[PDB]
Amino acid sequence: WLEGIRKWYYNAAGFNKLGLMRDDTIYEDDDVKEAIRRLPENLYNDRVFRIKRALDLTMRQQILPKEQWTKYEEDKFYLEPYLKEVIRERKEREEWAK
Amino acid sequence: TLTARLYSLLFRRTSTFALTIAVGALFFERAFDQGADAIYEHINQGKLWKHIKHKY
Amino acid sequence: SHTDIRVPDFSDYRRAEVLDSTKSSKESSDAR
Amino acid sequence: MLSRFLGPRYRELARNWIPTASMWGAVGAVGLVWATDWRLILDWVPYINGKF
Amino acid sequence: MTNIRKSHPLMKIINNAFIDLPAPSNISSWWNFGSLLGICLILQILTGLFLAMHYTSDTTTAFSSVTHICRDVNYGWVIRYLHANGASMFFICLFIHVGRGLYYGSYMFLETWNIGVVLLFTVMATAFMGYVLPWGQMSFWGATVITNLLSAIPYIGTDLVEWIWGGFSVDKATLTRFFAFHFILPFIITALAAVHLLFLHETGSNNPTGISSDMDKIPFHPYYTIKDILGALFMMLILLILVLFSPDLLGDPDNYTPANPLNTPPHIKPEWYFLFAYAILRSIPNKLGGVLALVASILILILMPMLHTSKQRSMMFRPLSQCLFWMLVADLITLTWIGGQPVEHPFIIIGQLASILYFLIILVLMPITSIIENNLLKW
Amino acid sequence: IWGGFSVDKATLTRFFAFHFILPFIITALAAVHLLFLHETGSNNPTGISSDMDK
Amino acid sequence: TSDTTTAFSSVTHICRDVNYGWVIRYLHANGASMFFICLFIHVGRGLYYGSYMF
Amino acid sequence: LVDPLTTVREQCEQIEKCIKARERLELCDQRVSSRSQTEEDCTEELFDFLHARDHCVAHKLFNSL
Amino acid sequence: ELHAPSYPWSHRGLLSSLDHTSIRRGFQVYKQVCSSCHSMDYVAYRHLVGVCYTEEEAKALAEEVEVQDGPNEDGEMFMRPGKLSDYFPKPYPNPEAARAANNGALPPDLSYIVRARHGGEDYVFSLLTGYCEPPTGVSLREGLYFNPYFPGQAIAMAPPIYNEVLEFDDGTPATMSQVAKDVCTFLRWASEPEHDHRKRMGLKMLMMMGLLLPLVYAMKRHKWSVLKSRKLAYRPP
Amino acid sequence: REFGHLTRMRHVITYSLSPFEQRAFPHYFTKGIPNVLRRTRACILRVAPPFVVFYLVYTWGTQEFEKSKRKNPA
């Protein structure tokens, strides 16, 4: 069923090796930077530490050791609610503009 | 430790460092030109107009 | 606390001269 | 984009700006014919066909 | 008292450019090519000047003047072959830079991307124009073919080929105007490169991951000068290998022959860096459609910022997109190989199919793969 | 500079090449000239600072 | 063409054969002359009104 | 004055590539000679006969010069 | 078409150079075989000195020929002995004269002939030793000659060189294959005079590249040693 | 966009060392070669097949062109 394909793709993606959650990999467009600003302090600090560690790792070209990789079931979509709220507000503003 | 005295006597000052580069450039060009040329006619011995001009 | 942090060991990277915890680095600094 | 430009007030803006843009297009066409000395068009206009 | 480095206007600009400019730490070698291009620009321009100091643009002296440079002029052969292989290496670096821009989502810097497309256009025009200057058989005949391709343009098109030729066909007037334009254009390239660097410096470069590296930025001078030095040295290693051991490797031997307009060469072909778009031109049967496909094959780079739909800017975490990108690279290699070969069976069908697959991958497979990519990651 | 010999074939070509390259250097130096001029403003005929009448 | 054997003939061809070539040639020459006139006037202005203090 | 090339060529004649090439050439020879008017010109198998022979020669000849 | 083999030329090595004695012999072949029909105008007797002949030999060689040049006080084109300044003599006054003389075909300029044909010397040599008898079914118009290597399978040049076609100054046998080898290597020298220098150009650079690359890279790594050994720790409250 | 206000970051502790106290090539071959094999294994499956299909099509096109130049027994 599809979840096996999803898990295979998560394994083959790469950002699990670098100790990155999913939302650390998303392109930073206007909605995304606004959502990042909207993040709470603790989540933002963990996010920036994770991103900095990943950049260090790819600078040295050393993947993070096997055991403490971000598991599929341990992946938390922390950014998703804030991004959904931002997208909803933008869509509402655009509907008002129309 | 030869490197220690070498640094303490001719590397610490940037002025003497530049003197080292400039002076050593003379002799490096000298030696490298001679060695590379010698290798070159060693590989190509007898086929240049330097080992056969005595014949003509 | 600030006193609970320590510099991680870099022994995998240190040059052979400056590697022991009981030699002043000034002696081998000139050589390095 | 596609949907965000597909609104009532956007077609209102389009209707408002149709005259100015449309006759800017006429400005450009006349300027092109003028600059190139397009004999296909300039022949029909009076008092200028004499230049040919 | 204030730093001359960041208070004097020229020094302040240089400092903010490539001394104290923050840069991502995880920048790979794929970005070094950028600086390499600049090097491969300067190393070109200077050499060109020296060539222009012994070149007499005329159909009675062009080949003779080039020969005089090659043989008689003190160390003139080295400058000539340095120039030719430097143009080839410039195109190698340009293609690698475009590939890097495609791979890591660097086209999200829209202004820099468009200025880069303009620079790429200008470089192709400069190289096409410059290859005429030696006035060999291949130079003149290829120039005739390429310029006559503009006859397919409706209405004005025919007149245009009379305008560009300076007459009825490629003759001395075309040679000298090509020389003058070949002189002027690289300085326009330099100005456009300065603008391209300004646009990029406004926002900063993009790391291979695609995530913003604002938290981890290192000064440019202490690190990314010597790394670029090493890259330029490697580029020089390759370039002098080409110049000093296989000088006329990529160049067609038929150039070393006076341009005789009474004899068509066995096969008329452009440079290896031109054979892919020329093969695209060959693929389409219609003449006007051929030129449209030829220009679109490069203009499609501007569409890339719009066609991106995956939520990840780069490609490190999109393996399907990586396979598609490598399929595209292999397709371009196939285009080059086909352009080298004559238009016969089965080269006709292979060239046609690869030409369709080029646009099909760029416009269709990549966006649909990106939609499937987003769907595969809960988002 | 003069190509040896006398003013002959080589001299004409190198003079043409330098004649072509130099004005672009002049353009760059003129851009630098304006860049150095701008942060000081300009000298009005009276020679007094004109910061109260810009 | 920068070749010595045909530079002067090339200039005469520019002034005699090219469409409106004489306009370009004499515009170039007298534009250089005016460039020097304006340069001397500019240096005179700079020396006069004390702009050389920049 | 005999030539090094002719003897090297003769020794290069007796290798199996050139043997099959010579048989094919002789078959085309008899075919074309027998038929009065045919555009079939024994050029191509002649070219393969060459391509074997000159390669065999070029591998050896320069040492004899 | 049938292309050329890959003959093991003495200069085909990566850092090898042409045999200058063979250059001199091939130039003798050019003088006394094809200088009557082929032109090598892009080269001069000055290029000869220092690679295949001495100054005195070059001077004698130049004066052995007569070149018509210069307008005298009466304006007539006077003939004078050739000198080191002069380029190689052109056998035919104008190209149309050459074509009308031979068969209408034009003998290509031998200056760049090797660098212009795909295959290089291995091509031209293969042509000179490739003069064959036309195969069965191929007719020959009287005046042409059959060469498999020439595109068109029909050359308009009679067999130039054969056994004892010349007498080398040294004394090596003038057999056809040796003559072809010498003339081909001489044509390679003429086409690319910088060849030897280029090889000497490369070798030094190669050794230089064996010295700058391991250093600069090391320096780079040295300057990267700060970052590559950098260690981080997260200490949230 | 310059050093001083690039972004905000807290509770990050970073260490490093002088270039004059640590080796420039710390076991360049002990872990360098295993790293190279790891990256090669990671990228080989997604890099090679597009190039291998090009290899096959190039060979097939060349051989078919050569065969077409041969006469076709008529």
Ligand code: HEM
């Ligand atoms: C953008 C960088 C440049 C590129 C890509 C370029 C490209 C070329 C190419 C491909 C050739 C033909 C080489 C050959 O004969 O095989 C050429 C020739 C020439 N270029 Fe450039 N060129 C550049 C910059 C310049 C500049 C700045 C000048 C003038 C200063 C110049 C002057 C010449 C001259 C005189 C020739 C004729 C000599 C020759 O063909 O070797 N080039 N150029």
Ligand code: HEM
């Ligand atoms: C005239 C030749 C060119 C020069 C001198 C040049 C110069 C540079 C330099 C020095 C960089 C920074 C280093 C790097 O990121 O690679 C850069 C970045 C970039 N260039 Fe170019 N460039 C040229 C051509 C192009 C072309 C043809 C394109 C594509 C259309 C392009 C698009 C880009 C992009 C997107 C970046 C940002 C890459 C990133 O941030 O990761 N450039 N350019």
Ligand code: HEM
């Ligand atoms: C290449 C030719 C030159 C160009 C294009 C150029 C351009 C300019 C321009 C546009 C201005 C502002 C307008 C003005 O104040 O006059 C200016 C000001 C100035 N230029 Fe130049 N200039 C040139 C040559 C020179 C020369 C030869 C000098 C004297 C050495 C010079 C010194 C100055 C000074 C001192 C000013 C300030 C004038 C003031 O504000 O009172 N320039 N330049």
